[PDB]
Paper text:
Dephosphorylation of eIF2αP terminates signaling in the ISR. In mammals, dephosphorylation is assisted by one of two known regulatory subunits, PPP1R15A or PPP1R15B. PPP1R15A, also known as GADD34, is encoded by an ISR-inducible gene and serves in negative feedback, whereas PPP1R15B, also known as CReP, is constitutively expressed.
Residues 582–619 of PPP1R15A form two helices separated by a sharp turn that wraps around G-actin, engaging the groove between subdomains I and III. Residues lining one face of the PPP1R15A helical extension form hydrophobic interactions and hydrogen bonds with G-actin. Human PPP1R15A Phe592 inserts into a hydrophobic cavity on the surface of actin, whereas Arg595 forms a salt bridge with actin Asp334 and PPP1R15A Arg612 forms hydrogen bonds with actin Tyr169 and Met355. The strongest defect was observed in double mutants compromising both PPP1R15A Phe592 and Arg595; their catalytic efficiency (kcat/Km) was nearly 50-fold less than the wild type, approaching that of the apoenzyme (lacking G-actin). DNase I binds the opposite end of G-actin, whereas D-loop insertion in F-actin and G-actin binding by small molecules, such as cytochalasin D, overlaps the PPP1R15A site. These findings explain the ability of cytochalasin to antagonize the stimulatory effect of G-actin on eIF2αP dephosphorylation in vitro, and the inhibitory effect of drug-enforced actin polymerization on dephosphorylation in cells. The crystal structure of the binary PPP1R15A–G-actin (with the bound DNase I) also docks comfortably in the cryo-EM density, and the continuity of a composite PPP1R15B>A chain is readily established in the consecutively docked crystallographic structures.
Residue numbers in the entry:
A (entry chain A): 3 to 375
B (entry chain B): 1 to 260
C (entry chain C): 582 to 619
């Protein structure tokens, strides 16, 4: 209420916010700031300069929208200040100056980004303490291990993050700029090619819903493309809110296949199965056995049914013949980063790892590199 | 000062994305220093935004807005959109009428009136309120009658007798018959002048119904009205349009009045 | 309030399981080892 530490997971698509000790975040809302394009009021209200999250999304027509987290990295601090102000005051209903605040960062977040993050928390929000955790590392902690390789796929970015004895191996971290909203856009494209139209805003936002509900990863893609026409079970129907009923067939598994075949959307990059292998082969040969046996999947874009079994297959094909391979896909893995942050911040050991106001006042923003790694 | 109340049938993204329909709607709005747009079917305010972009291309303060949340007892929901020229009038205060308990089944309006207090330095009346109502056709008698209580509410909150009540009241033909008018206090009370008469035609269709109305209470506001200025604006006649293109805009004409 | 009673203790057990597994990686000695690695 007035003492408990805060955990704020800042994502490209969604902000996950709550209290350390809780098993789930209190608040999950779009990482969006909207400013009125014109002067006016909502009936019975004074003039608003900004909306954040759900209200910014639902009123986007009269606003200019900003997505200040691009491919995991914060790129607009004015917008981000208003997302954080909304997180504390509107969503959690707390005073930031009363609560230690654990933030999350993308793997290989630039040092300047890290420092500005620490500066804002202390100078703009007056937090008594703060920490910055790599999102992939928290996910591994939440899975109940300190060694393994994490595949974190969200809305903006996918990462392979090998972790040993509790700490990331930065020289072996892979970044693929293919994730949730790329898959949504591809589905919108190929559903359009099937002979549908998503024109009105009401009809363009539902393509994400179809993706989250009806898409899956084929164990054998080539096989399921030939079986497509033949199959009695593939084709599914989705009802629009207006009444229209559209049919989705091979598009269900062609959409997330993009993860394994980035070429589908014109990227010359390698698939998430190849990046996972390449990440392990950049590590010491001494630990690879433990990495191969602890593939932990994280973020909303790993939620597709069958992705676990498909990873198992594609990595066994690439790895040494007799290597013991295990893919862990926690049912909670769309919030595993936040949940891992809740556990870390609840440990007695972590209480001396906080950057305190005193420490920041003596050392300045560069302290973050000394304390947060 | 020119004021209008315009029901634009299914005013949404489809109608505003249509460059022709947008042209005629914008031309109609541009006639008025204050205009109430009813039947705004705009989930994410995209149509309202695209209309304001069009209106404010050259000067960003040509029109300011007062817009409501989507109103309705069921899934079918409309907003009230006030567009005004801020160089002609100012908005001093706004509120949504408290029509009672929706969950109880006692709420008096399907679409609770939006209420705006205006500052008008250019007219005889300096301060006046506009109450917006698009009535449920099959509840027209009760809802128009309930506007009497909204007037008393405006009086209580702002100590203001100078109130304009306007919009698609559905105040003629099958929805309000001759005998039901004696049940409507807004008509039976001499406090209210009905500037749009029963004889007026406010339908773009071939029907003859005074559905859309402008009603004024208070000495100052009444004395500000230019005699004979209150009339429907037949946009089919004025823009030399076909009946088909006219209906594509709306099945209602605007009702306008001039103040001085 | 029975599904909640089970959920609270489940998470409490995860935190005590993390005190055992994770805290040895967060000891000033281990953080100095980890700090040297980079
Ligand atoms: N069941 C599901 N199947 C497929 N995709 C899903 C599912 N649930 C959520 N998603 C997608 O996951 C994404 C959100 O994941 P997440 O919250 O981990 O991302 P983020 O943290 O906002 O972004 P990033 O980590 O890339 O910065 C969205 O693209 C959403 O559509
Ligand atoms: C803009 O709006 C008009 C009117 O709604 C559209 O016109 C009609 O098109 C249909 C089919 O193309 C015809 O059956 C009608 O006879 C037309 N009606 C009128 C009144 O012209 C027009 O197509 C719209 N324009 C665009 C580009 O969408
Ligand atoms: Ca994330
Ligand atoms: Ca109501
Ligand atoms: Ca007519």
């Amino acid at each position: 209420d007035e003492t408990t530490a805060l955990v704020c997971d800042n994502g490209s698509g969604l902000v996950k916010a709550g209290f350390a000790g809780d098993d789930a975040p209190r608040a999950v809302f779009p990482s969006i700031v909207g400013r009125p394009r014109h002067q006016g009021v909502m009936v019975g209200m004074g003039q608003k300069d900004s909306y954040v999250g759900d209200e910014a999304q639902s009123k986007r027509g009269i606003l200019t929208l900003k997505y200040p987290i691009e491919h995991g990295i914060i790129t607009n601090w004015d917008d981000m200040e208003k997302i954080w102000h909304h997180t504390f005051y509107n969503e959690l209903r707390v005073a930031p100056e009363e609560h230690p605040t654990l933030l999350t960062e993308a793997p290989l977040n630039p040092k300047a980004n890290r420092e500005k993050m620490t500066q804002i928390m202390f100078e703009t929000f007056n937090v008594p303490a703060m920490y910055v955790a790599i999102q992939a590392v928290l996910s591994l902690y939440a899975s109940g291990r300190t060694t393994g390789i994490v595949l974190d796929s969200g809305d903006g970015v996918t990462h392979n993050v090998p972790i040993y004895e509790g700490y990331a191996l930065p020289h072996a971290i892979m970044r693929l700029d293919l994730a949730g909203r790329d898959l949504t856009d591809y589905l919108m494209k190929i559903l359009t090619e099937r002979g549908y139209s998503f024109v009105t805003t009401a009809e363009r936002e539902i393509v994400r819903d179809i993706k989250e509900k009806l898409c899956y990863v084929a164990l054998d893609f080539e096989n399921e493309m030939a079986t497509a026409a033949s199959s009695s079970s593939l084709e599914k129907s989705y009802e629009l809110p207006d009444g229209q009923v559209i049919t989705i067939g091979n598009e269900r598994f062609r959409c997330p296949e993009t993860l394994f075949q980035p070429s589908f959307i014109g990227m010359e990059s390698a698939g998430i199965h190849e990046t996972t292998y390449n990440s392990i082969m950049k590590c010491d040969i001494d630990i690879r056995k433990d990495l191969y046996a602890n593939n932990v999947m994280s973020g909303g874009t790993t939620m597709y049914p069958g992705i676990a079994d498909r990873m198992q297959k594609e990595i066994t094909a690439l790895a040494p013949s007799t290597m013991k391979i295990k893919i862990i896909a926690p049912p909670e893995r769309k919030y595993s980063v936040w949940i891992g942050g809740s556990i870390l911040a609840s440990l007695s050991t972590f209480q001396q790892m906080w950057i305190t106001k005193q420490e920041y006042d003596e050392a300045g923003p560069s302290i973050v590199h000394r304390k947060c790694f | 000062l020119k004021i209008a109340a315009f029901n634009i049938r299914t005013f949404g993204e489809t109608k505003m994305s249509n460059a022709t329909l947008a042209s005629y709607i914008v031309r109609i709005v541009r006639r008025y220093d204050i205009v109430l747009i009813q039947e705004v079917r705009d989930s994410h305010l995209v149509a309202v935004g695209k209309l304001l972009d069009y209106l404010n291309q050259d000067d960003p303060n040509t029109y300011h807005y007062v817009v409501s949340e989507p109103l309705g007892r069921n899934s079918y929901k409309e907003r009230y959109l006030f567009l005004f020229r801020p160089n002609k009038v100012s908005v001093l205060d706004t509120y949504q009428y408290d029509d009672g308990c929706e969950s109880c089944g006692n709420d008096s309006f399907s679409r609770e009136p939006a209420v705006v207090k205006f500052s008008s330095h250019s007219t005889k009346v300096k301060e006046f309120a506009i109450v917006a109502l698009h009535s449920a056709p099959s509840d027209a008698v009760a809802e128009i009658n309930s506007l009497y209580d909204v007037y008393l509410d405006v009086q209580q909150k702002w100590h203001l007798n100078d109130v304009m009540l306007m919009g698609d009241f559905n105040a003629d033909c099958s929805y309000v018959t001759s005998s039901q008018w004696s049940s409507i206090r807004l008509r039976t009370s001499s406090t209210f002048q009905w500037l749009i008469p029963d004889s007026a035609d406010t339908t773009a269709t071939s029907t003859n119904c005074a559905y859309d109305r402008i009603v004024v209470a208070g000495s100052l506001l009444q004395s500000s009205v230019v005699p004979g200025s209150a009339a429907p604006f037949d946009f089919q006649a004025a823009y030399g349009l076909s009946n088909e293109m006219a209906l594509a805009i709306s099945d209602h004409y605007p009702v306008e009045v001039t103040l001085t | 309030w029975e599904q909640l009673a089970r959920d609270r203790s489940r998470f409490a057990r995860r935190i005590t399981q993390a005190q055992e597994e994770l805290s040895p990686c967060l000891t000033p000695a281990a953080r100095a080892r980890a700090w040297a690695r980079l």
